[PDB]
């Protein structure tokens, strides 16, 4: 989430600058105006809460002074009308009233404070609704457009991206007998699949290779929970992700037979989400940064946005394994942006060793999520399909995620007015199911699929040289 | 589920024999009496449906004959009372009535058939409620008791099961820095964990070894869906598993923005469940049997039955990877029981090569699930803990699961009166999280944990010889 002082004119920030970034992202700029209005109404609520505290203390002071002098207390006990306001409840007005009457006034103030606090919580939630759906500040190099096909700038190109081959990944996944779509459609519903035999070893070869490649570079391999609590998932995901991406999990909340309540959880769509929440509410040391993680988890995506899109193969599925790069970086200097170029090259040198052709793409601001400031995608060339397909997404989220999860840059050299949060970045190293599709199409021959040089070590004896065809192409 | 002809006295079966097996399992025998009563009431409903069809055809016959002779049809159109019963609606009674009247009678019969069919469905569902919660026929060698600690017979003992070591798995998981419990408790809720660094490679070594061990023995490695549809999950799991084991998943059911409906799914607790449903509604060839699968999936368990049980380590968790043996066997001869002893020895020779001490246990009938006819558990010796802990469960479910999922033994040599279903078996090869606990406690030294001879091949360079301590023991 963004800093609130940017929305306030009393501080150094300006609301019009945030309105521009919303127009660049091609999203509603009226959320900025709703933010300022709610914050101004919240501010007035705080002034009312302070006045109620001052009047509560003044009521206690007048009683305390009258207890020392020991007034007859009073048996009236009826609340006077001519004193129940901010202007009327004064020191002189409270002096005329008896102890039993002032106690009745304080009780009404106590009820007013609880009502004011309920208003204060409501206004903060109303403010947060607008603040949640405002995207991060964009990098100057990000192309400002809503169209992807036209305005996505190609940065780097590696390998031959014109040579086309025999079969598509759809036919190749069946020919080697490592796919059961019709059976998976009955078991898990549409798009569900069973990966069998040879492709299980290929996936395990990719996982074993990706972890060793990152592990030697200083990354810490990390296996994460596959589901998260609602309170924590809302901090790492936006409202749209709850609508068209995240699965909802229902649990008991307690491991007791007497319990009848239910806790609502959510399946993760990325290793990014749980690793982001790993250092939640923490003060990270500058000396420890940059902390690098090699996330390993199964990802669950509802994929509601696309219907009739890659419905045959394992390219677009509800369930897939993915090795993730996650780096906690220093906010100062250009550390995060230097890491941003470091993480994409780590993904580049990964697919270069596997012999996969690709091009690097700078994604338009309109297709960027609220967290990311700049995204780079590695779109690999698919010879059988004849088109470029997305394999990697590299994003710098800066201090957006860190502010929400309260992950601070715990420096000890300066005393600051505002707390500085760390910079957080996420990039995928290898998406198993989609990487397999890239390997099958690029290494296809007359006999089968040739095992890449780097993956030969992790393949079992008998499948180290090549993965041969055993079934004919699924004909229509 | 069990065969219905066993409950019927008209067939060769006897209900009293099923009452005995329910008492042996220490479960309600009154479900057998409720089954017979519902089946008898269902039988009478079928006789009523046949009579309604005969009267419907008799109404159509009388009209058809009167259409040929061309009667004045009739303008009465009022339904007579003296004919609206099974005894009163006869050929002579329908002859007196006019065409317009008989058409009104047939419409009431059509409404009666729909009401009778609704009763027929209700009675079948009422019959199934009792049939679902009746366990499989027990093997003669299964000990009949409700107590596990007293009556569980120990079959085989391997290795030294008396030698105790320094630290428990709880301390060992933290000392090598591969566990984050407090962080996982915030992310996923209680019992949630992050496995990091060295233990990620250990898990990957176990997965890579278990798949190659089974793959060379004729098993087909299979990656399964992690969630299943309600209709299919109910066929592989009992009502108790929905109460204290299975997580509920909420999805849209359709990948469209216009859709507002929701489909209820369930996370798998075993690879057994999706692999059992793989050959759902199929006719398996005798020549193809035995079909052997090496299941690989993440298992999700709610673990509601146990509170305050192994709450510190990774031994009892909501989420764990597991390699599963699943065999479709021939019902004839002793093929399934020969495979039952083959699958347990496959699990035995697995932990013998890893150098883990254990004993084989025959579990009492009272603790067996509805599917299993006989269960054998491999309880490994834990030196640091000082007790035997469960790692493997080997079960022969026979034709219980196959009847429910309609998986038939498709023979072509004989013409039979009743369809014979295949025998299905399930046994775990390696439960990653619990196997790690067994390795850490058995291979602990002064420096760290020694890498087992078989796992040395799959460990990364630098962690092939030993996994050293980096942190002190979590002291209280
Ligand atoms: N439905 C799907 N089926 C299979 N693979 C997918 C699916 N959706 C995404 N992927 C793969 O997994 C990666 C996820 O990256 S991403 O969704 O674009 N963005 C992120 O989540 C970033 N945190 C990088 O992981 C993609 O690069 C893509 O290769
Ligand atoms: N809550 C848990 N946390 C970690 N591991 C578990 C948990 N529950 C069971 N396991 C492990 O996973 C295995 C599952 O086997 S089982 O539940 O007993 N029965 C089955 O599911 C059989 N189909 C064999 O897999 C057990 O042998 C045990 O070693
Ligand atoms: Mg995402
Ligand atoms: Mg994209
Ligand atoms: Mg089970
Ligand atoms: Mg057991």
Curated annotation (Swiss-Prot), chains A, B:
Effect seen on changing residue 428 to A: Catalytically inactive. Loss of serine binding. No effect on nuclear location
Subcellular location as annotated: Cytoplasm; Nucleus
N6-acetyllysine PTM sites in chain numbering: 322
Keywords of this entry: Acetylation, Aminoacyl-tRNA synthetase, ATP-binding, Cytoplasm, Disease variant, DNA-binding, Epilepsy, Intellectual disability, Ligase, Nucleotide-binding, Nucleus, Phosphoprotein, Protein biosynthesis, Transcription, Transcription regulation
Domain remark text: Consists of two distinct domains, a catalytic core and a N-terminal extension that is involved in tRNA binding.
Family: Belongs to the class-II aminoacyl-tRNA synthetase family. Type-1 seryl-tRNA synthetase subfamily.
Role summary: Catalyzes the attachment of serine to tRNA(Ser) in a two-step reaction: serine is first activated by ATP to form Ser-AMP and then transferred to the acceptor end of tRNA(Ser). Is probably also able to aminoacylate tRNA(Sec) with serine, to form the misacylated tRNA L-seryl-tRNA(Sec), which will be further converted into selenocysteinyl-tRNA(Sec). In the nucleus, binds to the VEGFA core promoter and prevents MYC binding and transcriptional activation by MYC. Recruits SIRT2 to the VEGFA promoter, promoting deacetylation of histone H4 at 'Lys-16' (H4K16).
Subunit text: Homodimer. The tRNA molecule may bind across the dimer. Interacts with SIRT2. Interacts with METTL6; interaction is required for the tRNA N(3)-methylcytidine methyltransferase activity of METTL6.
Protein name per Swiss-Prot or TrEMBL: Serine--tRNA ligase, cytoplasmic
Source organism (scientific name): Homo sapiens (Human)
Source taxonomy: Eukaryota, Metazoa, Chordata, Craniata, Vertebrata
